[PDB]
């Protein structure tokens, strides 16, 4: 509950440091596995 | 003799942004934090809004949002009915077989807590739709949007 | 001259932005490149501000 | 806390006006203040300090 509000408040922060901001934005998307890779490549 | 680099994308002169008072902010009436967020790609900003089409479609998209709210409420009540069925199964199991006096209430409270979480998810959906509708209804130029 | 370094950084990041836009890149990478270019021009005009 | 830092009125005043109830509440607040921008947890709240 309070932890949830804390996490949300955190997500709305700049962190100034541009490396820090990019390192934050790259973690949004999860990784994949082999079958996901092959289906994705087939789509491409 | 001087040269010049043709920037692939525009940039803002730092002297008119960071130098307090932020002259860009005073001109545009954007708070220095908001200007720093927009300029350094930390928050979007609205630059144009068709007030006419906003006004006229404030009923059609209202109808669409009513349809979507009805659909989310229908899945909500279906989840509640599934809870009711599972709770009937749980109470049948508890009071039909020989179990502890509290174990039956333990599982029943567990199920009602699962439904409390389901209703919390329903509130999450209600927020996700209604906050967005409210954001549109007051959408005007020079408004900052965090949480992309 | 200590200014050829800042100009070199600006030109590198501008050319890289041009190439990233030309190839077609996800908005994450191109926006990061744009932020870097803005920072490079800022550093060129005033370091440490 | 009142057993050790109890003799002074300043300490009792701090405990009363602190409003933080619980060890985990204090750890959560401390983590939220020390390293903001990352998702608060329990592991990175304790091992942090």
d(CA D37, CA A15): 7
CA distance B52 to B39: 29
CB D45 within 8 A of CB D28: yes
Q: Which residue of A has its CA nearest to B38?
A: A14
Q: Does residue A12 sit at the B interface (CB-CB below 8 Å)?
A: yes
By C-alpha distance, the chain B residue nearest C9 is B5
Closest CA to C30 of C21, C39, C40: C21
- Residues C45 and B14: their CA atoms lie apart, in Å, by 7
Q: Which residues of D touch A10 (CB under 8 A)?
A: 32, 36-40
Measure Cα distances from B57 to B45, B66, B142, D23 in Å.
22, 13, 22, 52
Whether D30 and A7 have beta carbons less than 8 Å apart is answered as no
The C-alpha atoms of residue B16 and residue B13 are separated, in whole angstroms, by: 6
Neighboring chain A residues of B42 at a CB cutoff of 8 Å: 14, 21
Q: CA A41, CA A38: separation in Å to the nearest integer?
A: 5
Question: Does B146 contact chain C (CB < 8 Å)?
Answer: no
Residue B114 and residue B96: Cα distance in Å, rounded?
22
Resolution of the experimental model, in Å, one decimal: 3.1
Chains in touch with B (3+ beta-carbon pairs under 8 Å) read A, C
d(CA D43, CA D10): 32
Radius of gyration of chain C (CA): 12
CA distance A16 to chain D (A): 11
Helix (H, G, I), strand (E, B) or coil at A34: helix
| Contact by Cβ (8 Å): B144, B119 | no
Instruction: State the Cα–Cα distance between residues A8 and B38, nearest whole angstrom.
Output: 20
Please list, in sequence order, all residues whose beta carbon lies within 8 angstroms of the beta carbon of residue B114, skipping any fewer than 6 positions away.
B83
Contact predicate B38/B46, CB 8 Å? no
Q: How many helices (H) and strands (E) does chain B have?
A: 5, 2
Q: C38 to chain A: nearest residue by CA? A: A18
Strands (E), chain B: 44-45, 144-145
The tokens describing B77, both together, are 């009540």
> In sequence order, which ranges of chain C are alpha helices (DSSP H)?
4-23, 27-45
Q: Which residues pair with B145 in a beta bridge?
A: B44
Given CB atoms, is C28 within the 8 Å cutoff of chain A?
A: yes
CA atoms of A11 and B89, how far apart (whole Å):
41
Q: Is C38 on the interface with A (CB under 8 A)?
A: no
- The experimental technique used to determine this model is cryo-EM
Spatial separation of the C-alpha atoms in residues B61 and C7, rounded to whole Å? 50
H or E element at residue B40: none
B-chain residues within 8 Å CB-CB of C46? 14-15, 18
- Which letter, b or e, does each residue of D7-35 get, where b requires 16 or more Cβ atoms within 10 Å of its Cβ? eeeeeeeeeeeeeeeeeeeebbebbbeee
Q: How far is C14 from chain B (nearest CA, A)?
A: 6
Q: Assign 3-class secondary structure to B53-72.
A: HHHHCCCHHHHHHHHHHHHH
Q: What is the DSSP letter of D2?
A: T
């Amino acid at each position: 509950e309070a932890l949830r509000q804390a996490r949300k408040d955190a997500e709305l922060t700049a962190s100034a440091d541009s490396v820090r901001a990019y390192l934050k934005q790259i973690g949004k998307v999860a990784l994949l596995n082999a079958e996901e890779e092959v289906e994705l490549a087939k789509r491409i | 003799r001087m040269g010049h680099i043709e920037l692939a994308a525009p940039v803002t002169h730092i002297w008119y942004f960071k130098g307090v008072p932020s002259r860009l902010g005073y001109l545009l009436d954007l708070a220095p934090k908001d200007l720093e967020k927009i300029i350094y790609f930390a928050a979007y900003v609205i630059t144009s809004v068709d007030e006419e089409m906003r006004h006229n479609e404030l009923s059609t998209l209202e109808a669409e949002m009513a349809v979507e709210r009805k659909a989310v409420e229908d899945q909500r009540d279906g989840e509640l009915e599934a809870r009711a069925q599972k709770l009937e199964a749980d109470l049948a199991e508890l009071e039909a077989e020989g179990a502890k006096a509290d174990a039956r209430r333990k599982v029943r409270d567990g199920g009602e807590r699962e439904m409390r979480q389901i209703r919390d998810r329903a509130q999450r959906e209600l927020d996700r739709l209604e906050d967005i509708w409210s954001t549109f209804t007051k959408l005007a130029p020079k408004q900052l949007i965090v949480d992309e | 001259s200590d200014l050829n370094d800042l100009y070199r950084r600006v030109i590198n990041r501008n050319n890289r932005l041009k190439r990233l836009i030309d190839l077609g890149a996800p908005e994450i990478i191109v926006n990061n490149e744009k932020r870097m270019l803005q920072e490079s021009v800022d550093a060129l005009f005033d370091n440490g501000r | 806390i009142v057993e050790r830092f109890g003799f002074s009125e300043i300490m009792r005043s701090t405990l009363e006006k602190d409003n933080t109830v619980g060890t985990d509440e204090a750890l959560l607040d401390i983590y939220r203040k020390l390293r903001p921008g990352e998702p608060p947890t329990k592991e990175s709240a304790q091992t942090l300090l």
